[PDB]
Structures are given as C-alpha cells and as structure tokens.
C-alpha cells in the first residue's frame, strides 16, 4: 500500500532517506494487534479512529480526554490518515488529568492494570503499550514498567524533552523497555530530545500532525510524538510475524536506518525506526 502526501513522519519510517512524502506499508496494517495508550485519554468518537478505539479505564472523574495529548498520540499509533498501524485496536487508559499531570502512584496503577486487562482482550497478534509521559527518576516507576514488559507487553516510553541524559528520568531509564528519542524532518536530533546510553531508538518527533479533541487536528512536537511511531511500528511488525513482544525493540534497532542522524552525542545510538517495506 501507499499513502500519498502523508505526514513526513510516516514517510520517513518507510524510506531510507529523508525528504519523501509517500508512506509505504503492508495492507495488514496491524490488524489483530492491540495498543494501550496510557495518557490523558482518547476521543474515541473521532472519525479518524473508525470505531477501533475505546476507553477501558480512567482514574479521574471522567474518561473523556479534556487535553488532547492522548488523542494526538493515539492518532499517530493507528488513526486512518495519521497512523502507522491503520487497522490496530486502540485502548485508552487515562492516568493523566486534563492538565497533562498525574501522580506516580496513579501511573503505576495504570501499568499494572494493562498487565492484567490484556488477559481478557482478543489480541491474537500481540499487545503494545505506549507511554508518552515521564518525570524525575523513581525506582518504583521503573519497576512497574519492567513488570508490564515482563507480562508480555511491548512497552515503549518517551525519553524526555529536557535535552539531557535520560538516565535521570523515569520510566525512560528502565533498560528493559524501549526508550524513544525524537528527530526532525532533516534527520537532526530534536533540539529538546533527551539522549544517553539508555536510548534504544529514534522516531519522528518534531512538527507531527495528528488527531486532536473536538474532531480536529493539529501539529505538536516532543518525544511524546516519537513514541507512538515506535509503538505503532511494533504492532505493524508483530502482525506480520517478524518479531514478538519480548524482542520487538531489539528487532527494530537491528533493522533501523543507521547513521542517518546528526547532532547525536557520543554514546547515544544513531538508529532511526524503519519498516523495511519492499513492494
Ligand atoms: Ca539513509
Ligand atoms: Ca531498552
């Protein structure tokens, strides 16, 4: 399949060179896989989700997304126009309030919930969890992310937007998950993106167009935008049978575009997510 005039992030992950505008992908498009979006919620009624998204858990008064952050990330995962895996199933877990904040104890409970909730969902091709959040270092938050990964879920987390080493931020500093940095359309490291040895992969993160609340769209930037690219790619590869939840992060790094990025400090991987699609 080919999506012409696609968002630059989608075209980048289906090309070995920057500057293209077509997203090449296999028609399976992640059908049979499931992706939990642990964020501010999802506006599941948005036409771009085609009825494939639903809220399953909230830790506040409502399950509605009153911020837009979670709706934006979920659209990058699997919306029709702006998504990597255009046929996956989306589940929303609202651990952040409508201001974009949340306590660590609530974020931990959300991860434990996903580990248990997947056992009563029909996801024959596997389960992915996308965490576009984080804060200061916390061993308890790292441990919860390691538990979710150990339970059989491919966990992708944002590296952070501090332009610093991600080793002082959680859950980005947990080695067993997949920590995602951000890049721009010129194959440069995003000026805000964290770095360090704990990073596993880079994804498109600057000026990312996706869905928004009120049935609209808008373009925002952050490592919170790069993570759903990797989460969507994992569901796309797992549906194709290329990898499993336990080894998806390693397979993505093994098959990524290598050396294409600039302004990468020494000690940080120079790897860019890539789907290796050949018609
Ligand atoms: Ca290249
Ligand atoms: Ca890792």
UniProtKB/Swiss-Prot annotation:
Transmembrane segments: none
Residues that coordinate or bind Ca(2+) 2: 16, 260
Keywords, alphabetical: Calcium, Disulfide bond, Hydrolase, Metal-binding, Protease, Serine protease, Signal, Zymogen
Cofactor(s) in the UniProt record: Ca(2+)
SS bond list: 34-123, 178-249
Domain of life: Eukaryota
Any one Gene Ontology BP term: proteolysis
GO cellular component: extracellular region
Sequence positions that bind Ca(2+) 1: 175, 177, 200
EC number: 3.4.21.64
Domain called Peptidase S8: residue spans: 7-279
Catalytic residues in the record: 39, 69, 224
Catalytic class of the enzyme: hydrolase
Entry's cofactor comment: Binds 2 calcium ions per subunit.
Annotated catalysed reactions: Hydrolysis of keratin, and of other proteins with subtilisin-like specificity. Hydrolyzes peptide amides
Gene Ontology MF terms in the entry: metal ion binding; serine-type endopeptidase activity
Function: Hydrolyzes keratin at aromatic and hydrophobic residues.
Stated family: Belongs to the peptidase S8 family.
Record's protein name: Proteinase K
Source organism of the structure: Parengyodontium album
Residue window of the full protein shown: 106 to 384 of 384
């Amino acid at each position: 399949a080919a999506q012409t005039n696609a968002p630059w992030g989608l075209a980048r992950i289906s090309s070995t060179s920057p500057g293209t505008s077509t997203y090449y992908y296999d028609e399976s498009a992640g059908q049979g896989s499931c992706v939990y979006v642990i964020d501010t919620g999802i506006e599941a009624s948005h036409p771009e989700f085609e009825g494939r998204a639903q809220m399953v858990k909230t830790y506040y008064y409502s399950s509605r997304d009153g911020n837009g952050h979670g709706t934006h990330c979920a659209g990058t995962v699997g919306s029709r126009t702006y998504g990597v895996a255009k046929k996956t199933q989306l589940f929303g877990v609202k651990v952040l309030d409508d201001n974009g904040s949340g306590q660590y104890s609530t974020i931990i409970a959300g991860m434990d919930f996903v580990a248990s909730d997947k056992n009563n969902r029909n996801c024959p091709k596997g389960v992915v969890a996308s965490l576009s959040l984080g804060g200061g270092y916390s061993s308890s938050v790292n441990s919860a992310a390691a538990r979710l990964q150990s339970s059989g879920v491919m966990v992708a987390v944002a590296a952070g937007n501090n332009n610093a080493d991600a080793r002082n931020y959680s859950p980005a500093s947990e080695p067993s998950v997949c920590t995602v940095g951000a890049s721009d359309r010129y194959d440069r490291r995003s000026s805000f993106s964290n770095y360090g040895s704990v990073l596993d992969i880079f994804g498109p993160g600057t000026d990312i167009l996706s869905t928004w609340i009120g049935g609209s769209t808008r373009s925002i930037s952050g490592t919170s935008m790069a993570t759903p690219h990797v989460a969507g790619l994992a569901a796309y590869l797992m549906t194709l049978g290329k990898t499993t939840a336990a080894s998806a992060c390693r397979y993505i790094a093994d098959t990524a575009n290598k050396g294409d990025l600039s302004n990468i400090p020494f000690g940080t991987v120079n790897l860019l997510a890539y789907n290796n699609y050949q018609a």
